[PDB]
């Protein structure tokens, strides 16, 4: 029902500002006794509270962040946004959007957003090079093969790989990206298919890298 989706750039440089926007649906953002907040979790560290905006419209922020946080909202568009200034890489995190079901009863967030990755660097973007990984089963189950896509050299996280425009979901394994010595990321996606489908089925991997605007569809046919 109440569903939250964060919008935001994936790459931002030190002097820039963070215009992160959250969209609420399945519930009014000005109703009952609801509070809306921002929470960021840097790479492998813990959750951090940024600030709240209540259904009445006044806001509160973390005292450490207070100086550069100017939360705002749009009731007509069922939105609320966060604004961060003077950004340094300490602001690199997965930024979250969350709801408080009551406010006359207390803190807790029931509903959350999937999060959006924000990375601060100087550090131009690079679109991924997509290569096809043709099948063979010398290490697989008889009848099953293994194909996939090599998403090489891209900055930064993340990239999303889907098969046949989301029509193929089963047996799909997308591997966590490797941060190379070069500073770029590289990942592979694998789908275990029955060998009988190689002379039959067309396999297309849909690679999407939102920061560099990259959207590549690669047909993975046997060699």
């Amino acid at each position: 029902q109440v569903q939250l989706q964060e919008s935001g750039p994936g790459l931002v440089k030190p002097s820039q500002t963070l215009s992160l926007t959250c969209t609420v649906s399945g519930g009014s953002i000005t109703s009952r006794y609801y509070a809306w907040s921002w929470i960021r979790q840097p790479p492998g560290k813990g959750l951090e509270w940024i600030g709240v905006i209540d259904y009445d419209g006044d806001t509160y922020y973390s005292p450490s962040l207070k100086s550069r946080v100017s939360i705002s909202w749009d009731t007509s568009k069922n939105q609320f946004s966060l604004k961060l200034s003077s950004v340094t890489p300490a602001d690199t995190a997965v930024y979250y959007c969350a709801r408080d079901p009551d406010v006359v009863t207390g803190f807790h967030y029931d509903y959350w957003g999937q999060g959006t990755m924000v990375t601060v660097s100087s550090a131009s973007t690079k679109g991924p090079s997509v290569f096809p990984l043709a099948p063979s089963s010398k290490s697989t189950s008889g009848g099953t093969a293994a194909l996939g896509c090599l998403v090489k050299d891209y900055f930064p996280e993340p990239v999303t790989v889907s098969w046949n425009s989301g029509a193929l979901t089963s047996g799909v394994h997308t591997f966590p990206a490797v941060l190379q010595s070069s500073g770029l990321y590289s990942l592979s996606s694998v789908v275990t298919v029955p060998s009988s489908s190689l002379g039959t089925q067309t396999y297309i991997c849909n690679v999407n890298h939102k920061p560099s605007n990259t959207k590549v569809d690669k047909k993975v046919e046997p060699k």
């Binding site: 813990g46 509270w49 807790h108 967030y109 290569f131 990984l133 090599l150 591997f175 990206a177």
Partner: protein
């Protein structure tokens, strides 16, 4: 500031673990808005408990909320593999502020052993045309989360151009890792083949691709 929770807590693949969340008089001591969230990898936190003892809709009865002074606690009675996640405590802070803890990564351990499934890939026609070469070795479905990758040129070992990821948790609870070998079109052609040798708990899984 922040709430102190142990960086790690490991539990018997049965029962029963307790996690501490330590605060101060003017947060955990005066207000009763202590909330616990469970975050399994890749997803957002899930409300597990609020108001010190209140279990949320759907939460099982084996999760418990407790508090002494400026220290809140979460108890898990009989853990499943579902429980393998990071745990965060929160509280109200004056005036109208929230605070999260450091986090506690719960590890369940009497878990069975799973041999790694290895898939090795030869450098694509497209990559070799682009004057580059990458060897894709994909390790998955392995428990515990510790592996060692040896790359072989024919039978001799390779150290240069090797990039291995740290093992990460899967949707099913097991581990996944990715090893990449960078070479040149001439290096891939001048050998009869390359092999990805994966070692896991005293056992070896070797996979071979040839130009």
């Amino acid at each position: 500031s922040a709430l102190t929770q142990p960086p790690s807590v490991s539990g018997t693949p049965g029962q029963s673990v307790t996690i501490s969340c330590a605060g101060a008089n003017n947060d955990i001591g005066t207000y009763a808005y202590v909330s616990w969230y469970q975050q399994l990898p890749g997803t957002a936190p899930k409300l597990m408990i609020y108001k010190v003892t209140t279990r949320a809709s759907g939460i099982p009865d084996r999760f418990s909320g407790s508090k002494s002074g400026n220290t809140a606690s979460l108890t898990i009675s009989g853990l499943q593999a579902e429980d393998e996640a990071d745990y965060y405590c929160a509280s109200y802070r004056n005036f109208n502020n929230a605070v999260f803890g450091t986090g506690t990564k719960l590890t369940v351990l009497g878990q069975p052993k799973a041999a790694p499934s290895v898939t090795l890939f030869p450098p694509s026609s497209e990559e070799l045309q682009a004057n580059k070469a990458t060897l894709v070795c994909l390790i998955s479905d392995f428990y515990p989360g510790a592996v060692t990758v040896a790359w072989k040129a024919d039978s001799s070992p390779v150290k240069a151009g090797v990039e291995t990821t740290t093992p990460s948790k899967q949707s099913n609870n097991k581990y996944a890792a990715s090893s990449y070998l960078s070479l040149t079109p001439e290096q891939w052609k001048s050998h009869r083949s390359y092999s990805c040798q994966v070692t896991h708990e005293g056992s070896t899984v070797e996979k071979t691709v040839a130009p």
